Symmetry: C3
Subunit: 333 residues, 3 copies
């Protein structure tokens, strides 16, 4: 199949982070996740493109899940860098239709719901923390849920993995919030705001005020609060990861979670989050002799990064009790 | 959820930068049992270490420490040590100790009882012979090894053969203790504690504190190298002990500190820095036995390669390393 | 224990910086078998490489080396090579060889005999065609892979299939040997050794020595790229071979050099420094930092990451562009 081979090239051109771990997935999961990724990538490139007017965008996002079924559908007017995935969509959608019906149900359900969610947020920033969760659910939680339903449909993981959508959602929210926290400056420089207004407006009048050197003490307080919010997903991350029985699936799910915990540790109480992108830490003496390939070691690596955070909690921070408390809760479970 | 247990894990993290994360990663009942064992031992260490407690007050403290586990109101408010918090709020610790299955209690109390006798015995004296060095390390670290192994077996996560093999469990403790005592010459000397065995150092200098001055550095590295050579004798037992373990969380908990000690010893070997300050510890991680073996073998080759011919222990260093490689 | 065997392990550590620890980590009977096999191979290689031994003197030694194993007093005193100690104290090595179980003796002798024949044949000729390049590699490395595999099967630590599939074991050795030859172009030049197949390099330059001249650096890299492309053909067999291993210590032993070999090709690909010094051997992204070659999915992901490092660097200008992309694409399938 030249078609399937073109899918794998698109994956390597398009997924810096998951291309290799996706290709190491056992049996039927390999193609199903490869394709899942490519359709979400296409959806994202559409949602992403500021050149497409909302009048054209809303229908594109709503009906995307059905383009999956229309052999000749493609989109020729994208201005995004990943636009080949839209221009050669018939190739991706052919292989999609070539998957076991059970995987198509999952992929198409996620595209459908993602599309609806994306359309809702086209017109609005995030206000409340509840709304932060809603946004991350649509953009990342559903990816967690989708993947997790693919693992279970393949029988490489027990049915609980797909059934427990709350744990799957938590996996996505944790990476998504960590990315949003990490990228404050790069997003600000690009006219994009993802930090929840109900939170930042308690510190400054505009989100962009975090970029100014006189507001750094406030910016960091806000940072620490959001980081603390994000840590609440850790018990679910640990629960989810500890249920996995397949090595290829475990590598795929664990590695991004570990990287995210490390990022949060590097960001906590860090002024640098606001002068640029943040330098990830050296790794503690215990983490250095472990990688993220069995559950106990993952646990230990997460616990260690929790301590790197706990060690740095300064009493004058207004979230300090809260940050101590969640970490403390996680440490005790 | 227990506010008492939350406090214990808080303490674990305050006092154990090194072991906390792997203790927390332990499967099932081992997690709480090892947490409590660690805190109880940390309380007992703190009493031992504290120089403001007169020997006559300290002896009963160490002797009777195991009984305090069963005295709900017992605590010590007089310590000035860094980890005093664990003695000052001992009731919270001993309460969580009493919530453990008896199976675990029996082991912890038994180790405390024996450790206390041992600690008290060495209060008055400095370590003389190598046999004595072993005895002291047996009491403060070998017993920990033995108690830990008995906890793994009692929990059923490890085979009964793990807890029954007390000799190799003891060697696991002796190796960490000796490495730490080798590494901390300088820290120990400027806090007025002597742990280097006298029958060894007294062949090089008149007072153990002489290794701290520049003009005795040659002799100092000589004695250092002799002590490291002694410590390496434990590595075979370490490999055998680790090879028996079948639980991955226990394996990580046991293996990582051993591999870290081996790295320390490799960094310290022939290294003058031991006497001038702290030492820089410079496709595999330590979570399966064949990888651990290879890491260990590599560190050994790093020692083998720096062996100076002139060094008094050179042949002996070569011998033990040769033995380990061929095993 | 045996003082004889201790001497063997000293020699092992003197001669194999790379493999020693990993060989020492092998389970049970395999440890001494592979240690002794390595040393015997090392002694044979030393006879082969030593240019102070005339072809006429050398051939009969290569031919009879397999039988010297049963001559307790046999030693060689006239080598001036670095590892001459293994020839000079060969009786110690052959003593321990004769202490191996007989089923391991049979294997080691058989390989030594066939390697000797091969080595004799190439002592007087250079490598012409790619076919001839596989044959030479077969003789000096492919057979090592075959020998090792048969040791694995005879020990019952691996399935009988491992030893039987001689083709897949051959590809493991070919991949290493081709990688070393590719990496070592410059050191080999300065030593009067030529291993690049002439039917390949003669289509670029009149004399293999010209790649060392600054002027032809562009034609040089192009050959460098075509040979790399040739080596990449073995990777699917490497993956297949690795995928069959069930013993951890054996897996570790087999996977790690294959990974170091792919890492080396990635680094050498399109890299001009292959003709100025030794190539700065280097790391991937944080995911290869977050994994190590000790399980099959992790090795696949590591392989795929290095696969993409090469893919993204393929210049259109290059005459092998199309075949490099096709082989990589094949590996991704
Ligand atoms: C149970 C477990 C998971 C790990 C072992 C950690 C502990 C607390 C072991 C008890 C052995 C010690 C530390 C004895 C006293 S020497 P010292 O270390 O008290 O001397 P120092 O700290 O330098 O004053
Ligand atoms: C198969 C697998 C592991 C994962 C799927 C990965 C993909 C392509 C997910 C799409 C998620 C979306 C819509 C955006 C990225 S976060 P954003 O909304 O902040 O950025 P955006 O502006 O939409 O690019
Ligand atoms: C249940 C489970 C295992 C996971 C939760 C879902 C996952 C994996 C991700 C959330 C979606 C995101 C943020 C994808 C980025 S893909 P990328 O690397 O292509 O983005 P890039 O454009 O390269 O920065
Ligand atoms: C048999 C077996 C599994 C292990 C051997 C027994 C163990 C674990 C330890 C021996 C006691 C020592 C030397 C502890 C280090 S104190 P520390 O390093 O805890 O002090 P720190 O945490 O750095 O404050
Ligand atoms: C099937 C399988 C498991 C393996 C394939 C066959 C093998 C192992 C090797 C081929 C020989 C080579 C090129 C060795 C590396 S150089 P070196 O050893 O001289 O480098 P060093 O001297 O050790 O530093």
């Amino acid at each position: 199949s030249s078609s399937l081979k073109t899918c794998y090239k698109y994956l390597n051109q398009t997924s810096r982070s998951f291309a290799a771990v996706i290709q190491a997935l056992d049996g039927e999961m390999r193609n199903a996740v490869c394709i899942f990724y490519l359709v979400l990538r296409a959806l994202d490139t559409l949602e992403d493109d500021m050149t497409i007017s909302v009048e054209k965008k809303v229908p594109l996002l709503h009906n995307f899940h059905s383009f999956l079924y229309q052999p000749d559908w493609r989109f020729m007017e994208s201005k995004e860098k990943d636009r080949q995935v839209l221009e050669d969509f018939p190739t991706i959608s052919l292989e999609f239709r070539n998957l076991a019906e059970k995987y198509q149900t999952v992929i198409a359900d996620i595209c459908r719901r993602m599309g609806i969610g994306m359309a809702e947020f086209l017109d609005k920033h995030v206000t409340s923390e509840q709304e932060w969760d809603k946004y991350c659910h649509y953009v990342a939680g559903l990816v967690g849920i989708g993947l997790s339903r693919l693992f279970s449909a393949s029988e490489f993981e027990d049915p609980l993995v797909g059934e427990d959508t709350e744990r799957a959602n938590s996996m996505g929210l944790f990476l998504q919030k960590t990315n949003i926290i990490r990228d404050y400056l790069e997003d600000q420089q690009g006219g994009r705001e993802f930090w929840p207004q109900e939170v930042w407006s308690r510190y400054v009048k505009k989100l962009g005020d975090f970029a100014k050197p006189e507001n750094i003490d406030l910016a960091v307080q806000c940072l620490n609060e959001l980081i603390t919010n994000a840590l609440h997903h850790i018990p679910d991350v640990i629960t989810y990861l500890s249920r996995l029985r397949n090595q290829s699936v475990f590598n795929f799910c664990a590695i991004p979670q570990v990287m995210a915990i490390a990022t949060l540790a590097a960001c906590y109480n860090n002024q640098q989050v606001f002068k640029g992108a943040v330098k990830i830490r050296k790794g503690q003496a215990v983490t250095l002799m472990m990688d993220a390939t069995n559950m106990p070691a993952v646990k230990a690596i997460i616990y260690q990064y929790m301590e790197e955070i706990y060690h740095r909690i300064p009493d004058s921070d207004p979230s300090s009790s809260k940050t101590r408390q969640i970490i403390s809760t996680i440490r005790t479970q």
